[PDB]
Design a protein around this ligand. Structure first.
Ligand code: CL
Ligand code: CL
Lengths: 5, 102, 109, 5
């Protein structure tokens, strides 16, 4: 995901 | 005037792969949808077309029940979506949300 | 494929009632983002001359439920309740809202 | 609510 690992 | 209509961006529990297949066929960057994650039950995911790829964002929810992706918190999922129509959905690249065609 | 016709977002409970009271079949429903409980979901369903509301509970693993059986998505909760009653008190099976062009319902901006 | 108080 772009915002979280 | 605000005619009560279901949100056109909600596709429920469609696979991440199926979301990518659908979004790769769209013509414009920013074409998106919101789905219920299979890998992370209980989390919604925002999938977005970006060139020859599809980027996915985890929709987060704080203890006060507000929805967010980064820092700015929202009182509803539709407010999150609308905000990201004029401000980038990513802090890394400039991507603005736009409705899926057809 | 096709977006779902039952997810309405943050609409007042009273407006969920106004809309569903115009539907002709019992079971016509919607899921909305609750105003009384931010971050939670409510399921509203037409039932005779009334509209019933169900609170979508969440457990520690993020699953959704109404009674005992737990689900990994609202989509699965909804689909299960198309065949098994959404309520343990009366028999009410979920069915998609029907488009009524001559009877629109409005929310405030 | 039908399912909770
Ligand atoms: Cl049950
Ligand atoms: Cl039941």
């Amino acid at each position: 995901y772009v915002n979280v690992p | 005037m605000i005619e009560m209509k279901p949100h056109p961006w909600f596709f429920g529990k469609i696979p991440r792969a199926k979301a990518e297949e659908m979004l790769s066929k769209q013509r414009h960057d920013g074409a998106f949808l919101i789905r219920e994650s299979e890998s992370a039950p209980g989390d919604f995911s925002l999938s977005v077309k970006f060139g020859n790829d599809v980027q996915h964002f985890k929709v987060l929810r704080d203890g006060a029940g507000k929805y967010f992706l980064w820092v700015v918190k929202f009182n509803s999922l539709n407010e999150l979506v609308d905000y990201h129509r004029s401000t980038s959905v990513s802090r890394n690249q400039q991507i603005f949300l736009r409705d899926i065609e057809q």
